[PDB]
Design a protein around this nucleic acid. Structure first.
Lengths: 155, 113, 59, 148, 90, 58, 99, 90, 125, 156, 80, 169
RNA sequence: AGUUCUAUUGUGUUAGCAUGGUUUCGA
RNA sequence: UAAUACAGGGUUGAACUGUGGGUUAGUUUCAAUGCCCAAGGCAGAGCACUGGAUUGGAUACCCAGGGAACUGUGCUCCCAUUAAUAAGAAUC
RNA sequence: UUUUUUUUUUUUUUU
RNA sequence: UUUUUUUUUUUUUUUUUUUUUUUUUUUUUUU
């Protein structure tokens, strides 16, 4: 005996009324005079918020299982950005581990299979290392050689 | 099914006795529709603590032997009781033959790597 | 009972896919546009840009 | 390091959806535009003590000092519906028991983290306003009021 | 990597993907979604989804469409009626 | 084909341990999974470790 | 369609049984006494038949007589001389330092 | 670990708080009970002080509160010092 | 018949958007009548279970009270002249199971045929 | 059984180690239990109670360690973690070498031994790169080493 | 010219006051005795410090004090 | 001065030492009573069985380990109140096999000359022994012979063999 | 849900063995 | 509660089966301790019982001795009656 | 003398 | 009564599974 109704008085069903509705009744009942701001909110009533939260849903985190395979084949990802807060290895959005897996999930949405995504992701990121990172490093290094003004024979 | 037995001899056991012991055992095997597999030796073994067996004395080491066989399951009890009566044998045990783990097919690369 | 014909979820999905000769499930991501708020936030500022209603708070 | 339980289900927030913010500002702007047209209109900016970036005065009109004896959920801002006509609360979580039956519009600015964990604030707030970056209201409103 | 980089993608954004077609899973009476016209009970609004195998608008679809449009228009509660479709790229 | 699940009720009873100084089980032992238990995947999300054996054929 | 699955089941069990035969073959090869007793048995068989043809005696007595002796002299080639002492062996291998 | 020969099945909340690991009240099940909120009415309890009610409207203990509300509060200030304007806005 | 009484528990929820329900032939017909009155936003048969949406208005749901009259262990029957006395001066919804399909209580009296009271929707005492 | 040897240590110090050895193995607890006969019913409840108190002690012991550790170091943690916070180096002087595009601009606003030290130092660099003094000091342009020198002539 | 790009701010490098372990709430009267025994094996006491982290349980004669409300209101008035 | 790490941890987090981690797998072979050189680690000073929170092992193998150590003691092949000695750290196998096996590792790590000679003689003396590892290592020395062909072609400017291997991309 | 096969076994029964507290003996 | 023999239960893989079910007398097994009967013995314990303490007026509390009771294919279920205070279906 | 008790006794050993 | 040594008889739970880690997944309005 006591709160033994799962489907009943336990779950309240009280109507939610905003300021626009509550003020409309008091003014009509003659309990309170009409304020100067009553008409301001009448033309632009507030947007309902109770029905917006109903669309909330919980989705399964696919990164927990996908990230396990990435580190197994390439366990050299934890060294990068180790001294920064937020990263744990006992990861931030900027971490290489999160970047690589993000592309895999995005590609699968188009229709690619789980195994096919790995090959596409590996090649996509490989070009960035050889076409941008390697080129940038080599270009900068070349300029260093030109700095031979210290030698007496330079002039 | 297949079976295994590990017998630990004493210092007071000659080669004469070992041959006799094994011959006796084979009698039982054949009785129960069986056949011997193989017989091997492990040499001497060091004992962690002194063994004090009544009416036998005290020993610090012995000769470890191993032999495989196969017979009816009911033959294990007869074999176990025979070993205990015979002298020389201070300790023995019977272990069933497994598929993967065995002293026949699996004897290499244990301690190394 | 196993031979009963009941409209399930996977049953209808296979029917649509069979029509496509050897056209699959696809999803769409949310549209994030910066001009939705960048080009509108300035208008709201005009309603409070007065010095007598902004300096008192952010003094 | 962390030795606690790792969550698996990731909850989604639809109240602060990027698309929902489009209608939130548009609807809010209309209400403020009509109110400022009328003469003699005053507002209230209620914040928190931790908000150092926002300057505050010494005295506060409508503030009522009560004692512990006979204080069963006393309403502090009971008389704040005479002189003022619009209150902009910055900490709805803290100011939740006092604004339950307030006779004035409340322009609360909360964050998705608090809304999901404390949905009770939705009933007291009339006009919901988003809060980009959702970190600290003290430095949040300053950027909006000092755009360009 | 940096948040301000051109080629930056938020892992959370791709995790909350949804199919717009699946949004209209629920419809009017009839579990099997095969009617040429659908309707959803709303407050002050009239929903009408045109679902078909290949978007073929035959006499069957017109008969249902005319009834739903007239039924919602006559109702004073429904101040406006919205129309949409359900086929993919059609 | 469409087939519905079957009833979770099964024969036998719950595990019971005999009273007194003689500790012994009556019907079932400690290794008994009830019919209303969750899936094994959710109970052991960690799974086999790297140093675990990949062949339990003892 | 049920008949189709019948063929698949036969193939599945066939592969499982194939692996079982390999395990038993190992035992035979690995077994020394099995081969030794088997080898001996065969030899006596031919000697009894060949000797009977010369003297003219019956093969029942010869075979019988010989059979008995094989079991008695079965354990003659043992133990393969394993007098090696692990305790001593390890000491010289820089693995034991107790005396 | 020790091999227990039985198990205890208490019923009163007195001894249940000792044998059990904890008796903390977990979150109520949404499927059976509503979610608790701060908007609910407070319990009807009169104020008492050492047995003498107070229904009128007109040093060691104090030191302990100051040591926790003052020393700890000053630490939080330094965290925001290097984030608001002094380092965040160059 | 047992599965019919199991729909009230799922449909009677406040903090929820959609609830599942076991699939049944009789259950499908019941949902059709409720949707006409504007009590259910919609439903879909997801195979072994049916997904039914919930309708809300100003926070509170449209359904506030459900009473089960008929039970698998017995059967309630009322004559055309007796149903009027039972149902009078009320806005409730009574599901009537007549020979010619399933109809509401309002239509049962119009035809004058003897129906069967299954369940009550938005009913008081 | 436990055995210890005294070597360059006082007897009191050595005796303190063996005393704690019994606590791990519960030598004292087992010695007293066997002395007196305990009813089986009492052991049923005592065995269960020890499974709730001991686990709680371990958690509280770790908490005390943090208090002592933090007392000698001061400081305190707060809700400072925020995803919307780029951890960029402050003041961040070290940068890539100039590509010769900005080098010329630097000399344009520094011509005016202290401030005139750069004169004749960086200027010779530009002349050397163009190949004015030495015939072997001529360098390569940035626009003739990436189009048909690294994207097609790669060793791989 | 190959150094790190981001500053060093990890917790491991800089020790701080925190508790990297979760445990169910315990009764105040149950934990008071345990803490006293540890102190016997020889600023603010440890009992008060742990209370700020909400480690103890809400027992009959022990309740978590409410947050400061009367001494935390700071509003500003301006025209509109 | 590292932060004080609590000793009591959930089973999800565990960092067993490298030395003991390799012994647990045992080349994907369950530990039995014959593995005497591995059971010596799972025993305390007094000879008691360590708990699952110290050896850091799985639930399935924890029960198997307890059986192997228990049986070894019954056979008078394990101590009862102290740790084993250096003279009892050997599995239950052929004594001769131990020697051969032992020597093979030395020849592969540092390349002991003495070890090689020993095995050579033993090859013929004990043909009934396993020499798979010894034969495989010697058979793998073909890299030295093939290297001669590369050198011989190098005199004729034959560098095409090196570029092809590098041209992988 | 149930039957067959395969991996897994501190669940029921079980005569000899090993170790151990107490007890017992004194070429 | 290491070894071995007989036969159950639980988890996973394949095949088969194609509504086989929930509850349960005029029913049937098992079931701590105590008691009758029976078998028994040579250890460790102890009810009754004259064996060394009581009082500020009465006692079994604190030692020691001590022939019942402690292994059963049996007779047999009185209790604080053996893993919560529901044997099933639906909503996560 | 030993054992035992808050304390003590009974009991046991005899050069 | 203490210590030491070398084989009689009865009996068999000390060591060995665990932060109660599923949407925390469940216990009964009020004082």
């Amino acid at each position: 005996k006591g709160a033994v109704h799962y489907t009943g008085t336990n779950f309240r069903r009280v109507q939610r009324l905003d300021i626009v509705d509550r003020m409309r009744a008091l003014v009509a009942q003659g309990l309170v005079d009409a304020p100067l701001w009553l008409s301001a909110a009448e033309r632009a009533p507030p947007m309902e918020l109770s029905n917006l939260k109903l669309m909330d849903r919980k989705v399964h985190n696919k990164y927990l299982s996908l990230t396990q395979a990435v580190l197994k084949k390439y366990p050299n990802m934890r060294f990068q950005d180790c001294y920064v807060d937020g990263n744990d290895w006992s990861y931030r959005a900027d971490h290489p581990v999160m970047q690589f897996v993000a592309l895999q999930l995005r590609l699968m949405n188009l229709g690619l299979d789980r195994h096919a995504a790995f090959r596409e992701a590996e090649q996509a990121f490989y070009a960035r290392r050889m076409q941008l990172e390697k080129q940038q490093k080599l270009n900068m290094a070349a300029a260093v050689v030109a700095a031979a003004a210290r030698d007496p024979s330079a002039f | 099914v297949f079976y295994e037995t590990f017998v630990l001899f004493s210092k007071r056991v000659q080669r004469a006795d070992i041959r006799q012991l094994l011959k006796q055992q084979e009698a039982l095997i054949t009785k129960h529709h069986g056949s011997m597999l193989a017989v091997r030796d492990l040499g001497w073994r060091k004992t962690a603590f002194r063994v004090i067996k009544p009416r036998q004395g005290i020993f610090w080491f012995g000769r470890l032997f191993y032999f495989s066989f196969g017979a009816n399951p009911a033959a294990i009890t007869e074999m176990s009781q025979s070993l205990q009566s015979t002298n020389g044998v201070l300790r023995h045990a019977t272990v069933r033959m497994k598929k993967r783990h065995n002293l026949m097919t699996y004897n290499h690369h244990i301690h190394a790597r | 009972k196993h031979l009963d014909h009941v409209p399930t979820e996977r049953a209808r999905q296979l029917a649509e896919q069979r029509s496509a000769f050897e056209p699959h499930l696809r999803v769409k991501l949310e549209k994030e546009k910066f001009l939705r708020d960048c080009m509108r936030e300035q208008e709201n500022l005009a309603a409070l840009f007065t010095e007598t209603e902004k300096e008192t708070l952010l003094g | 390091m962390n030795f606690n339980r790792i969550p698996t289900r990731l909850s989604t927030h639809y109240v602060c959806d990027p698309y929902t913010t489009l209608m939130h500002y548009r609807r809010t702007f209309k209400f403020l535009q009509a109110l400022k047209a009328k003469p003699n209109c005053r507002a209230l900016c209620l914040g928190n003590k931790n908000q150092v970036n926002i300057s505050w005065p010494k005295h506060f009109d409508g503030l009522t000092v009560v004692t512990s004896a006979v204080a069963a959920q006393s309403s502090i801002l009971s008389s704040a519906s005479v002189y003022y006509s619009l209150i902009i609360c910055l900490d709805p979580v803290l100011f939740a028991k006092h604004l339950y039956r307030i006779n004035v519009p409340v322009l609360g600015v909360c964050t998705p983290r608090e809304i999901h964990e404390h949905p009770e604030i939705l009933k007291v707030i009339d006009y919901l306003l988003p809060a980009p970056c959702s970190r600290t209201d003290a430095a949040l409103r300053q950027l909006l009021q000092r755009e360009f | 990597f940096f948040r301000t980089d051109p080629g930056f993608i938020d892992p959370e954004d791709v995790l909350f993907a949804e199919d717009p077609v699946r949004t209209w899973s629920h419809a009017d009476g009839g579990g099997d979604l095969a009617e040429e016209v659908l309707e959803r009970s709303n407050v002050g609004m009239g929903t009408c989804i045109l679902n078909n195998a290949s978007g073929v608008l035959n006499m069957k679809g017109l008969c249902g469409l005319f009834r739903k449009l007239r039924d919602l228009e006559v109702n004073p509660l429904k101040r406006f009626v919205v129309l949409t479709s359900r086929h993919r790229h059609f | 084909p469409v087939v519905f699940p079957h009833t979770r009720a099964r024969a036998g009873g719950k595990p019971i341990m005999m009273r007194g100084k003689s500790g012994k089980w009556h019907w079932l032992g400690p290794y008994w999974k009830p019919p209303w238990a969750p899936s094994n995947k959710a109970r052991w999300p960690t799974g086999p470790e790297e140093w675990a054996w990949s062949d339990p054929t003892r | 369609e049920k008949k189709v699955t019948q063929s698949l089941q036969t193939a599945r069990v066939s592969r499982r049984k194939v692996a079982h035969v390999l395990w038993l073959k190992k035992l035979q090869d690995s077994s020394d006494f099995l081969q030794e007793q088997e080898e001996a048995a065969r030899g006596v068989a031919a000697l009894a038949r060949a000797r009977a043809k010369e003297t003219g005696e019956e093969e029942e007595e010869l075979l019988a007589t010989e059979m008995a002796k094989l079991k008695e002299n079965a354990f003659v080639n043992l133990p393969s001389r394993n007098v090696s002492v692990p305790d001593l062996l390890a000491q010289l291998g820089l693995n034991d330092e107790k005396v | 670990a020790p091999f227990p020969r039985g198990i205890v099945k208490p019923r009163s909340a007195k001894v249940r708080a000792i044998l059990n690991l904890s008796v903390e009240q977990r979150q109520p099940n949404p499927l059976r009970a509503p979610r608790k909120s701060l908007l609910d009415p407070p319990p009807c309890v009169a104020p008492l002080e050492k047995g003498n009610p107070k229904l009128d409207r007109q040093a060691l203990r104090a030191a302990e509160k100051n040591k926790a509300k003052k020393l700890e509060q000053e630490s939080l200030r330094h965290a925001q010092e290097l984030e608001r304007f002094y380092e965040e806005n160059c | 018949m047992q599965r019919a009484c199991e729909m009230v528990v799922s449909l009677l929820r406040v903090d929820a958007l959609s609830q599942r329900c076991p699939f049944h032939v009789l259950n499908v017909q019941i949902l059709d009548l409720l949707q006409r009155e504007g009590l259910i936003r919609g439903f879909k048969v997801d195979g072994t279970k049916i997904d039914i949406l919930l309708k809300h208005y100003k926070g509170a749901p449209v359904i506030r009270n459900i009473r089960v009259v008929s039970k698998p262990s017995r059967d309630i029957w009322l004559t055309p002249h007796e149903l009027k006395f039972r149902t009078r001066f009320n806005t409730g919804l009574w599901i009537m199971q007549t020979s010619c399909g399933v109809i509401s209580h309002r239509d049962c009296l119009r035809m004058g045929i003897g129906g069967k009271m299954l369940m009550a929707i938005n009913n008081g005492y | 059984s436990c055995h210890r040897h005294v070597f360059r240590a006082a007897p009191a110090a050595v005796f303190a180690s063996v005393q704690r050895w019994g606590r791990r193995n519960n030598v004292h607890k087992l010695t007293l239990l066997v002395q007196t006969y305990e009813k089986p019913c009492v052991k049923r409840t005592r065995i269960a109670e020890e499974k709730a108190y001991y686990p709680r002690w371990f958690y509280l012991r770790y908490a005390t360690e943090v208090i002592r550790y933090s007392l000698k170091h001061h400081l305190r943690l707060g809700q400072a973690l925020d995803p919307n916070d780029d951890q960029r180096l402050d003041a961040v002087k070290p940068l890539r070498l100039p590509s010769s595009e900005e080098r010329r601009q630097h000399l344009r606003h520094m011509e005016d031994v202290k401030l005139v030290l750069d004169i004749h130092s960086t200027r010779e660099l530009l002349a050397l790169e163009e190949g004015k003094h030495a015939r072997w000091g001529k360098s390569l342009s940035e626009e003739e080493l990436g189009k048909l020198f690294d994207a097609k002539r790669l060793d791989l | 010219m190959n150094g790190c790009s981001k500053r060093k701010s990890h917790r491991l490098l800089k020790p701080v006051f925190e508790l990297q372990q979760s445990f169910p709430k315990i009764q105040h009267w149950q934990g008071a005795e345990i803490l006293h025994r540890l102190k016997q094996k020889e600023s603010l006491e440890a009992l008060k410090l742990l209370e700020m982290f909400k480690v103890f349980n809400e027992t009959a004669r022990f309740k978590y004090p409410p947050p400061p409300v009367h001494s935390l209101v700071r509003g500003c008035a301006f025209p509109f | 001065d590292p932060f004080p790490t609590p000793h009591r941890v959930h089973e999800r987090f565990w960092d067993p030492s490298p030395d003991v981690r390799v012994a647990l797998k045992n080349n994907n072979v369950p530990i039995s009573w014959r593995d005497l050189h591995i059971l010596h680690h799972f025993v305390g000073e007094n000879g008691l069985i360590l708990p699952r929170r110290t050896t850091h092992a799985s639930r399935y193998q924890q029960r198997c380990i307890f059986k192997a150590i228990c049986m070894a003691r019954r056979m008078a092949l394990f101590p009862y109140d102290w740790k084993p000695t250096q003279g009892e750290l050997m599995p239950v196998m052929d004594p001769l096999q131990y020697l051969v096996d032992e020597l093979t590792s030395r020849y592969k790590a540092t390349g002991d000359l003495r070890a090689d000679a020993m095995l050579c003689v033993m090859l013929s003396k004990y043909p009934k022994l396993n020499y798979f590892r010894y034969l495989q290592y010697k058979a793998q020395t073909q890299k030295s012979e093939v290297e001669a062909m590369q050198q011989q072609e190098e005199e004729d400017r034959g560098d095409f063999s090196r570029l092809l291997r590098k041209y992988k991309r």
